[PDB]
């Protein structure tokens with residue numbers, strides 16, 4: 132059994148520590164490693180708690196064990212009595228959430244890139260589900276689908292807010308293999324429409340109520356134009372993905388087998404052209 | 411310390427297996443993983459040739475970093491042994507520099523990012539505990555990913571091939587030669603020269619042994635207008651980097667950390683957009 136240890140990073144090695152965002156998991160800051168000469172990202176919560184330490188160490192172990200092409204690569208851990216945090220590669224293009232909803236900044240997000248993003252999300256989650264034992268994300272949202280330098284996906288913040296990606300059966304306490312695909316069906320809808328799921332709804336409870344009654348984000352000509360490539364296929368994927376009955380939702384394998392023919396239609400140059408258009 | 415175990419990949423999980431090349435350290439094939447649904451590269455071959463595969467696996471697994479080839483798993487069966495890594499669609503730096511018909515242009519910003527990335531990768535190895543030394547840096551084992559970012563592979567020396575990247579004092583190897591923390595920077599310097607000129611080092615000299623004599627004396631690849639034009643961005647500071655890196659005396663050669671610090675302002679002069687334009691031009 133070949134083993135690899137996660138490097139320990141001394142806090143004094145991280146320079147230019149600039150704030151980026153504060154979330155439930157912690158505060159994300161950009162920095163540069165003094166020795167390695169690369170930009171990094173740091174996640175930290177001053178005294179915290181005795182149990183709060185057990186969380187940060189658990190996320191680091193998860194990222195380190197779930198290493199893959201579509202999972203945020205972890206570079207090291209800051210484990211000092213003075214400062215606690217995880218260090219990962221720096222994602223310069225933010226979250227899928229920002230790309231989809233910052234419409235003045237991004238008026239055109241070409242179809243091939245949207246499909247590649249959807250393909251990559253499914254590849255990362257599929258990889259998790261294929262580990263031994265299977266790792267379940269359970270918190271998939273557009274906010275934690277990160278975008279690297281070339282707009283390739285890196286999945287973060289996982290296994291271990293917003294309930295729009297939570298399946299109806301999760302509302303009541305439960306004693307859960309079909310969660311992730313529900314979240315993925317919503318993300319797919321969001322990616323293809325660039326609309327916020329349930330725009331007309333003020334209170335999150337009204338969403339939760341509607342979802343328990345089998346209602347989903349709206350599928351019509353307004354939300355999903357008829358000119359969307361592979362529209363029919365994508366609609367089937369979405370509708371099966373978010374089906375009320377968990378048993379009627381596909382595995383990520385089935386989902387990938389469905390996506391593969393779609394992705395083969397796009398030339399490699401079209402992904403590059405979609406990216407250059409965003410700059 | 412937290413431990414990550416390298417996955418064992420059953421050989422039968424690999425489908426659509428196609429031959430890519432035959433190298434000194436083994437045969438390289440492309441494939442798709444049946445469960446993970448990604449393209450992969452597979453490197454394969456008694457009880458002695460077995461430990462070499464396992465060693466490169468362990469090194470790739472321990473040396474994980476943004477500019478090092480990511481290993482995905484290992485095939486360890488009585489029927490088949492080999493390593494599985496991320497598939498590099500754009501081959502080696504060597505093929506980029508010397509396939510002039512296939513690649514008429516290789517824009518300056520891309521060349522500089524390639525150089526910056528090789529340096530970041532090697533630097534990382536040098537900064538591990540204990541320091542990992544490459545000792546076989548050549549253009550043939552600098553791999554290029556889908557968007558022409560660098561992945562360093564082949565830690566087999568961490569029959570042979572090319573001698574042009576080997577420093578003179580390493581010609582007759584010893585205890586001092588194998589522990590030399592200044593081997594790699596010499597290789598990097600020759601690589602830097604080769605990148606900036608798109609010329610085969612010592613082209614005039616067609617006899618490999620003669621190159622070895624010339625290099626002993628103090629001769630290096632030709633630094634003139636013919637090989638390195640005046641139009642080359644930051645020409646002077648690069649020649650300074652090359653010449654100091656391939657200096658006859660190992661004590662006069664800089665660390666990668668110093669080369670990086672020199673390179674940082676050079677890379678900042680290129681707008682982000684140009685890197686993307688360069689890749690589109692090659693595609």
Ligand SMILES: COc1cccc(-c2nn(C(C)(C)C)c(N)c2C(N)=O)c1
Nearest residue numbers: 151159172173174219221222225226287
């Ligand atoms: C350092 O660890 C993490 C963990 C999860 C997400 C991020 C991260 N968030 N963002 C925001 C988009 C939320 C600012 C980035 N740009 C991150 C990164 N790795 O670069 C960092």
Ligand SMILES: COc1cccc(-c2nn(C(C)(C)C)c(N)c2C(N)=O)c1
Nearest residue numbers: 430431451452453495497498501502563
């Ligand atoms: C499977 O392990 C390796 C190890 C070292 C190099 C390569 C590799 N060589 N090439 C050649 C350029 C030599 C064909 C590729 N395209 C590789 C890859 N990782 O895709 C593979």
Ligand SMILES: [Ca+2]
Nearest residue numbers: 512691692693
């Ligand atoms: Ca061309």
